Amino acid sequence: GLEAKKEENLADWYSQVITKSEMIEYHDISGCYILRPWAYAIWEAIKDFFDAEIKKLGVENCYFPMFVSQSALEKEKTHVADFAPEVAWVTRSGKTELAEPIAIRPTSETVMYPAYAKWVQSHRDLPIKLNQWCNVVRWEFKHPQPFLRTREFLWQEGHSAFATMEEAAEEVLQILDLYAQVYEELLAIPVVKGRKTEKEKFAGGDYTTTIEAFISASGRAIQGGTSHHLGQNFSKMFEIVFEDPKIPGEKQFAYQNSWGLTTRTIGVMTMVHGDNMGLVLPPRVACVQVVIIPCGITSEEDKEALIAKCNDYRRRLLSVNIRVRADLRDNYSPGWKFNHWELKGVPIRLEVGPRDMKSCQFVAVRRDTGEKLTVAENEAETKLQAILEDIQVTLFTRASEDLKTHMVVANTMEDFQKILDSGKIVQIPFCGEIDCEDWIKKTTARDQDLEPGAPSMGAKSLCIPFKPLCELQPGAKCVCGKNPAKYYTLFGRSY
Amino acid sequence: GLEAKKEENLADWYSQVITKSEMIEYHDISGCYILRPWAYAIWEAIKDFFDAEIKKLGVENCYFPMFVSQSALEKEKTHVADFAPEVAWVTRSGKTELAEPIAIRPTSETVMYPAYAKWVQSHRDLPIKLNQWCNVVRWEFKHPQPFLRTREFLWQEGHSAFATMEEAAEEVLQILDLYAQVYEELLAIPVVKGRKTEKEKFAGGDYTTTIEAFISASGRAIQGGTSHHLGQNFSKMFEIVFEDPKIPGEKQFAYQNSWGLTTRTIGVMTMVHGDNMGLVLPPRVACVQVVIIPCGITNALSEEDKEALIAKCNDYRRRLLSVNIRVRADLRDNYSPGWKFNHWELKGVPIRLEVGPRDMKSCQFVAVRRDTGEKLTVAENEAETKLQAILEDIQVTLFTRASEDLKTHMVVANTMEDFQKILDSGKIVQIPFCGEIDCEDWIKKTTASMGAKSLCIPFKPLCELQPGAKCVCGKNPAKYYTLFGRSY
Ligand SMILES: Cc1cc(N2CC[C@@](C#N)(C3CC3)C2=O)cc(NC(=O)Cc2ccccc2)n1
Ligand SMILES: Cc1cc(N2CC[C@@](C#N)(C3CC3)C2=O)cc(NC(=O)Cc2ccccc2)n1
Ligand code: PRO
Ligand code: PRO
Ligand SMILES: [Ca+2]
Ligand SMILES: [Ca+2]
Ligand SMILES: [Ca+2]
Ligand SMILES: [Ca+2]
Ligand SMILES: [Ca+2]
Ligand SMILES: [Ca+2]
Ligand SMILES: [Ca+2]
Ligand SMILES: [Ca+2]
Ligand SMILES: [Ca+2]
Ligand SMILES: [Cl-]
Ligand SMILES: [Zn+2]
Ligand SMILES: [Zn+2]
């Protein structure tokens, strides 16, 4: 049974939920977590969708080494200046010192782009569109959080190289739209699409696009995924050059993107939809969508028939592409099974007892609302499908409502401060400068009016939304007062 | 095309094939290699099959950390002694030296089994059946070789814990049989199932089962996959215990297996089926089974005819997709037909489907099998039936050829001079063997090129060991026929 309450101690609730749902186990090293099957299956559902979608775009999967040489790691100055403090270094094998230290990838731009340089000789060798599913290591000494912010994590990183800026620009937004589909259609989490500010953009990149999710339980926002246009910044450093004989002699540098998505998805899903009974799985990613549990059973051969009827429902659901398990163990009581599968967030519990079997009916119990329904055996495939779809809509609708009551506009620093301290994220007119962003962080921390159990921190930028709530009026001032605003920018306390 | 010849410098042939088929690229860290999409797709076909099969056995996928602490790594002393010289160690982040060095997994027993000990708190928590698809590092300084022997490689590693030895022993063999299915049904590679000798078995395990494949062109054998029974060696160290259901208070240690299969699969496929034209893909793992190539698109051909040709190609494409044939239509106009013939030949695509304007106007096409190079003219209306047949025949042919090779090069010998002769003729030999470690080192020393090593004790030997037969050492009696050879 779950006893930690989400609105009381969020961090302890989160830890109880991810362990009792059998999603996470703690490793004997700090910041290292084990993905047990219940969580890994969500990642695999995400993988299946995104893999199919990028393959439609011409992207192919591959696998590049996990190690970088010091020489390659340092060829793009901005990139390495940003990643160097958290790059983990292998310096020996057994007791034998290595030829030279080699680094574990924090990201694979510097692993992959020397090979791209070899592969690009003429204009027809482009585009190059590669993806890999792998682990990366970002060894920060700040406090880790399972799924949300870890030293090692699973992800996918896509890397594409084009002869023209137009093709690259097109791909950046296509990928970002796929990440939005992952969050909104699979995980039932609404997100805000936008551009990262100058301060927050990928070091070494031209510009970074992003999707941002809002976690109302902490009132904080978090980046769900990211799609960068790298311009020619890496092609010039790694010599990814072609010669088009229609532009004789002139070396031409490829235009590049990289884009990434991680198992942070599963953490956001946990934080958004979880409740005080435990995890709540959107049916689109649930490892088990329907769990069948036999009740009653306090007369043999009926008990033998009851088990048979549970397996009948199981086969009927398997036949219609509903993912189903029959918890037929006798080693545990029906109540223990109810609790076990509620903790795990199974969308529907299918209860079968003797009376209902002899009456050609069953009971379906929805996990999002607890609502109980009696269904005729004949309708099992239809109604369950309906309920599954309805659950997915409900989860999304609720999450959407929370986002829209918690994201509002403010046009002055004082209104921004007050709204922010009330637990919301705010679209403000913004001049765009890094220095002004720093000042916003510092002063929104300095001026914070604390609300009970609210996070103590300054506001950061989240994204410049593609579709802001309001149109920037002509000659509007930034909240800094001294510069004209360039755009509405979403700000909030964030992970 | 391809210039280096397989029967000459095998290593240069191998290098040329793996790069010109766009399977491998060299990384700037000597000894590490890039798996380009042509190779990765083979790995993905193998994963699709194996994943489905083990999920039928109750096994579930997970992901454990890449890092091991010094204390967990050394708890099973045999295992750590075997792996310690090739464990890679992280000693700093940025410029900050780490407080304690952390190891990268060479294999995940010592990462997973503390968690297993936490998860088993009664007999009902068993069995535990977990698998992960991931990368491991074994940083030897020997000479690496793409696919076959690398410092970093992708694999799958399965780890199961049971209450009784009978369950564990059953799973060891089920997994070994799936590995043999990967090699024989998917990769068209015959293998020999057997048991490793005491000398060659997994350090810290009780016994190791294996499949061994034979590479005609080198005379050498290579281990394809392995399935180990760890017994209670690891559960005694990591305290994986449950209470006896019948005896109150009595704790019992779980029985464990682990089993692994790597991208070495691809290397063996390349070495067994490749020829002097390049890679040769078995249809069951070929990303592209049929490639459609328009020919004859000269300057004289009308726009009417050229667009009709392209549409004919797309219609073959649709038809082959409708019958589940993995087909690529290569309609690019900025590459010549000959370039495409060569490109897809080097990549080992099973069938090239040629359509020119005259063939379209004759309601037929040309299909060229990669393995034999035979050109067949096929009527349009039979495309789906014939190509399917040919794909099956290709898979059968590749297996039959390789099986003939194995039968040719795996013979029995009962004397040591006979063993030495057959071994230096480029074969592997089943010999009467006493099993002793010292005598295995002795065979290695005497047979040295290099000395032969133990490969497997075959489940099904070629000969019944005649009662009272003496080992090849001529000192102690033989316990079993053992396969020996020069090994990868
Ligand atoms: C789980 C996860 C996710 C992500 N990040 C990053 C942005 C991104 C997005 N979008 C990446 C592009 C894909 C993302 O998901 C980042 C991380 N660790 C870290 O920063 C390192 C660390 C470790 C412990 C504590 C604090 C920091 N850990
Ligand atoms: C690609 C691959 C495969 C395998 N091994 C092992 C046995 C096994 C089987 N069966 C594994 C249990 C599954 C296998 O495939 C082993 C390896 N590297 C190494 O030993 C490290 C190395 C590196 C350079 C030179 C020499 C040695 N590299
Ligand atoms: O780390 C990043 O954000 C980019 C996207 C994936 C690859 N590198
Ligand atoms: O390395 C090995 O041989 C065993 C089997 C896979 C995991 N550990
Ligand atoms: Ca599962
Ligand atoms: Ca950093
Ligand atoms: Ca620009
Ligand atoms: Ca110029
Ligand atoms: Ca207050
Ligand atoms: Ca491919
Ligand atoms: Ca060793
Ligand atoms: Ca005792
Ligand atoms: Ca004809
Ligand atoms: Cl056998
Ligand atoms: Zn400003
Ligand atoms: Zn002997």
Numbering used by the authors:
A (entry chain A): 1015 to 1312, 1316 to 1512
B (entry chain B): 1015 to 1462, 1473 to 1512
Show me the paper's own sentences about this structure.
In the current study, we examined five ATP-mimetics L95, L96, L97, L35, and L36, based on the 1-(pyridin-4-yl) pyrrolidin-2-one (PPL) scaffold. We successfully co-crystallized all five compounds with TgPRS (L95, L96, L97, L35, and L36) and three with HsPRS (L95, L96, and L97), all in complex with L-pro.
Significant structural variations within the catalytic domain (1016–1296): ATP pocket (1152–1165), loop (1210–1220), and motif (1084–1115) were observed for the three co-crystallized structures. The loop 1152–1165 exhibited ligand-induced fitting, and the residues Arg1152, Trp1153, Phe1155, Lys1156, and Arg1163 formed a cavity-like structure to fit L95, L96, and L97. The L-pro pocket exhibited minimal structural and rotameric changes. Similarly, the ΔTm (°C) values for HsPRS were 19, 21, 16, 23, and 10 for L95, L96, L97, L35, and L36, in presence of L-pro, respectively, compared to the apo-HsPRS.
